[PDB]
Design a protein around this ligand. Structure first.
Ligand code: LHT
Ligand code: ZN
Ligand code: ZN
Length: 218
């Protein structure tokens, strides 16, 4: 299995790639972010494992940063795998109320801090967490960095196919995808969970794949 990797994408914006074997899909590549505000670091999604999460936290602790927060974009393992470990290490975890509700019904450890607002400023003028509506899951969020104009689309951005449909809402995805396109047209870069960083066009490609998926449904 490939080692956790961390790459600077921009001043104050890092991508973290982690890997795990999932039945059927094989070795899954999961991209997350780390955002720096002054001396504070914020985790956008955790690696699959407490181990990789520990490795990620130590990387920024070693460089003089303090982890002031972590946001999970939805309730599946590839966003929440490290939450239990982060809690034990006194690092504040965030998730939407919907995400925390789904984690509870799944018997999984919940984030410590939750929020219900469609648009939540995790850090004023720096990290916005946005709920476009159901798609990949009922609770999937995206994260917007207005300074860099980077959108983290998580498992919601699916330009070449929708992937795991287990908890997907095919009827809502296209509406949610078009809502995303409406709000973040000004996006310079779109970082997704499982595909290469692209431009704003990746929001339109997701809409096309959602529409296609919905059609096969009927
Ligand atoms: C462990 C969980 O966290 C799980 C989850 O969150 O549900 C992980 N997330 C997802 C996900 O859908 O976001 C998957 S599957 C992932 C899709 N993205 C990669 C991929 O192979 N994409 C792809 C490419 C071309 C065609 C198609 C097609 O479906 O036809 C799919 C792999 C993971 C196992
Ligand atoms: Zn998922
Ligand atoms: Zn995923």
């Amino acid at each position: 299995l490939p080692d956790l990797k961390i790459e600077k994408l921009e001043e104050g914006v890092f991508v973290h790639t982690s890997f795990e074997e999932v039945n059927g899909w094989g070795v899954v590549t999961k991209h997350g972010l780390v955002v720096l505000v002054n001396t504070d670091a914020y985790l956008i999604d955790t690696p699959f494992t407490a181990t990789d999460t520990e490795k990620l936290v130590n990387w920024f602790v070693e460089r003089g940063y303090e982890i002031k927060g972590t946001i999970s974009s939805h309730f599946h393992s590839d966003s929440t795998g490290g939450i239990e470990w982060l809690n034990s290490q006194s690092i504040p975890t965030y998730a939407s109320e919907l995400t925390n509700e789904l984690l509870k019904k799944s018997g999984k450890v919940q984030a410590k801090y939750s929020f219900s607002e469609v648009s939540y400023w995790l850090v004023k003028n720096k990290i916005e967490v946005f709920y476009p509506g159901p798609g990949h899951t009922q609770d999937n969020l995206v994260v917007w960095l207005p300074e860099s104009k980077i959108l983290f689309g998580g498992c919601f951005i699916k330009p070449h196919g929708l992937g795991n449909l287990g908890d997907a809402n095919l009827e809502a995805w296209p509406k949610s995808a078009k809502i995303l396109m409406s709000k973040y047209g000004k996006a310079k870069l779109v970082v997704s969970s499982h595909s290469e960083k692209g431009d704003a066009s990746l929001m339109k490609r997701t809409w096309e794949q959602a529409l296609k998926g919905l059609k096969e449904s009927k």
